[PDB]
């Protein structure tokens, strides 16, 4: 009768682990998605009844790997392009005043300099247009802004910056769990788990104050943060209805091409065909003011029921984090959002808003400092339309007496952009070997 | 919100014996020691641990929402100010003297 040990191979059991997921895509561009196994036309998904798991973002390891992987693909695409070492010279600039408005007074400069030709013993005189945010005066003659911190590099204008959806699949012996609860927090027990072979299509779009082209919530507005009473932690808001934002670069740009030596080309900026006007983004004033109302209801649940809630504009910092910075069609924008966060909500028109933007060409993408990049001009007129699907906030500290909480837009760390998409997944490792007692015993022969 | 109150404004125990200081603090908690005209220095963080490089005379324990700081085998130089902080909020510390 005395029970004996029996051995089972293939029992459903798993623990937590870390590995290297590989990525899969559909069907040239920076993210090198032409070195990704092609996806399959069958997203199989299995539901797991009666089982509740424990999720915890802000410690998810799928985020620390999406970060280091797109920092590595970004550098891989700059290794074969043109080094612009001859461009740190002395420039001789002049204001552009040909059919401008009065807002663009001083935003464009017309600089002339000496460049190297294809022969080591000949020089050429050349001009090009530069934005004011890219040159500095030598002694109050200009120079590019990066020439005392790093070297610039940019060619390969046949590589696009358009984001492409990317699926992260797991190797053999591992699995990806997925929480299907609709009112899910960051952490805690999710009682409606399910398993997949790889995630949905994630777009690697980068931005600073608003989250763009992301995914929406299904029930209502969600508010996630680790230790909301610690004012050194950001807050992640997620809308349930998108807000549109139309942006444009209304100037008609032309593009020269300068042979600096053999087989090297520099893409300057020629004259502009028409008038010089400012770039901007238009947002519908009614829709925006409404969703801002749906955010203060959820924001009130964490604080007292009769608290005053204010929105203010950013308080300082670098240009990347004090504005809404994004990339639309190969140009990099920096828009002044000080007209969106300006209001005060206490308890108990039909037009648009216009946000003015600036443009830069010397980009230092990730906080790394020793290597910048140039961005060639784009021909024609730029225009894009995007969905706003979230915010990144930051609460003012030192608030006692339990009244008048103040929030300001934040950002800067791109990991918060990935946590807004990978908060549903976790990686487990299968343990297919188990023992148990039973009555059978091995037949001695 | 955050509540915080500590309880001997200033005791006047002498050399040798041991004393305790109690802070009532909702939500983490730390203890600091600051001589006159000097920058403070950390003794005990999270309410129970102690920083590497401090005599083991100091040690604290927690129960409910009341924390305790107590020092054993008083010394001629352990007379200074002691206060407890939670995160932006601090309190006017206590003074001990022989």
């Amino acid at each position: 009768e005395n029970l004996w040990v029996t051995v089972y191979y293939g029992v459903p059991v798993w623990k937590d682990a870390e590995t290297t997921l590989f990525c899969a895509s559909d069907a040239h561009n920076v993210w090198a998605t032409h070195a990704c196994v092609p996806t399959d036309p069958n997203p199989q998904e299995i539901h797991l009844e009666n089982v509740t798991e424990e999720f915890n973002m802000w410690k998810n390891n799928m985020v620390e790997q999406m970060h280091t992987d797109i920092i590595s693909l970004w550098d891989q695409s700059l290794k074969p392009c043109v080094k612009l070492t001859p461009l740190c010279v002395t420039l001789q600039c002049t204001n552009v005043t040909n059919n401008i408005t009065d807002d663009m007074r001083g935003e464009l400069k017309n600089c002339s300099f000496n460049m190297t030709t294809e022969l080591r013993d000949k020089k050429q005189k050349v001009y090009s247009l530069f934005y004011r945010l890219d040159v500095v005066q030598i002694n109050e003659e200009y120079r590019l802004i990066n020439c005392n911190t790093s070297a610039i590099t940019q060619a390969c204008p046949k590589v696009s910056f358009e984001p492409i959806p990317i699926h992260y699949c797991a190797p053999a012996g591992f699995a990806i769990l997925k929480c299907k609860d609709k009112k899910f927090n960051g952490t805690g027990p999710c009682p409606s788990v399910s398993t997949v072979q790889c995630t949905h299509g994630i777009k690697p779009v980068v931005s600073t104050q608003l989250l763009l082209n992301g995914s929406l919530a299904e029930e209502e507005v969600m508010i996630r943060s680790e230790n909301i009473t610690n004012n050194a932690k950001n807050i992640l808001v997620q809308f349930n209805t998108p807000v549109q934002i139309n942006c444009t670069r209304p100037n008609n740009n032309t593009r020269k091409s300068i042979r600096i030596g053999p087989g090297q080309a520099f893409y300057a900026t020629g004259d502009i065909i028409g008038d010089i006007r400012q770039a901007h983004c238009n947002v519908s004033k009614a829709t925006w003011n409404e969703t801002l109302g749906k955010v203060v209801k959820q924001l009130r649940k964490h604080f007292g029921n009769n608290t005053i809630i204010r929105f203010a504009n950013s308080s300082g910092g670098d240009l990347e984090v004090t504005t809404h910075s994004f990339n639309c069609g190969g140009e990099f924008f920096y828009c002044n959002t000080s007209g969106l966060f300006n209001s005060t909500w206490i308890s108990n028109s039909n037009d648009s808003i216009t946000l003015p933007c600036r443009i830069k060409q010397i980009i230092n993408m990730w906080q790394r400092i020793g290597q910048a990049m140039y961005a060639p001009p784009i021909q024609g007129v730029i225009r894009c339309v995007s969905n706003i699907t979230g915010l990144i906030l930051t609460r003012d500290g030192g608030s006692t007496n339990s009244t008048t909480e103040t929030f300001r837009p934040g950002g800067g760390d791109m990991r918060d952009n990935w946590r807004s998409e990978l908060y549903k997944y976790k990686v487990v490792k299968i343990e297919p070997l188990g023992v148990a007692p039973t009555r059978c015993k091995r037949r001695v022969v | 919100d955050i509540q915080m109150t500590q309880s001997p404004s200033s005791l006047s125990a002498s050399v040798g014996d041991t004393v305790t200081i109690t802070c009532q603090a909702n939500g983490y908690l730390n203890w600091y020691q600051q001589r006159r005209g000097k920058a403070p220095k950390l003794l005990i963080y999270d309410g129970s641990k102690l920083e590497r490089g401090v005599p083991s005379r100091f040690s604290g324990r927690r129960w409910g929402q009341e924390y305790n700081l107590t020092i054993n085998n008083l010394q001629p130089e352990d007379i200074a100010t002691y206060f407890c902080q939670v995160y932006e909020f601090v309190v006017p510390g206590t003074r001990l003297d022989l």
Partner: nanobody, 121 residues
Framework: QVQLLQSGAAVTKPGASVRVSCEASGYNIRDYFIHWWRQAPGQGLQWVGWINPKTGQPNNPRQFQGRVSLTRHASWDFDTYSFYMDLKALRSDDTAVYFC????????????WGSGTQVTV
């Protein structure tokens, strides 16, 4: 060593500004927030506010809004960081001593402090 060097004392008339510096020397500077505290004669400490040194972003309480400015600056060898606090509209109450401090973890446990700088009007 993880020292946080600070600058000397200063005194000026009301209605004027003042700048106080604080150097960071011996660790990974870009991974820890920097806080500024203030102590008045015969009082407890007071939180002036924190700064993130990677992006450079400040955070101040409602009492100091519009008067304090926290900034930072690095050098082209990236080893040294200089943090600055600027106060704009001085009064008699701003007579105090100011402390640079380096947060260490999510307990807000400040293990290293600066010497402190006394400034009065």
């Amino acid at each position: 060593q993880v020292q946080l060097l600070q600058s000397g004392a200063a005194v000026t008339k009301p209605g004027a500004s003042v700048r106080v510096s604080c150097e960071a020397s011996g660790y990974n500077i870009r991974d820890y927030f920097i806080h500024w505290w203030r102590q008045a004669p015969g009082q407890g400490l007071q939180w002036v506010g924190w700064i993130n040194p990677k992006t450079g972003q400040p955070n101040n309480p409602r009492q100091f809004q519009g008067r304090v400015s926290l900034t930072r600056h690095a050098s082209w060898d990236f080893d040294t960081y200089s943090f600055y606090m600027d106060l704009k509209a001085l009064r008699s109450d701003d007579t105090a001593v100011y402390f640079c401090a380096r947060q260490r973890s999510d307990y807000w446990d400040f293990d290293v402090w600066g010497s402190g700088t006394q400034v009065t009007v």
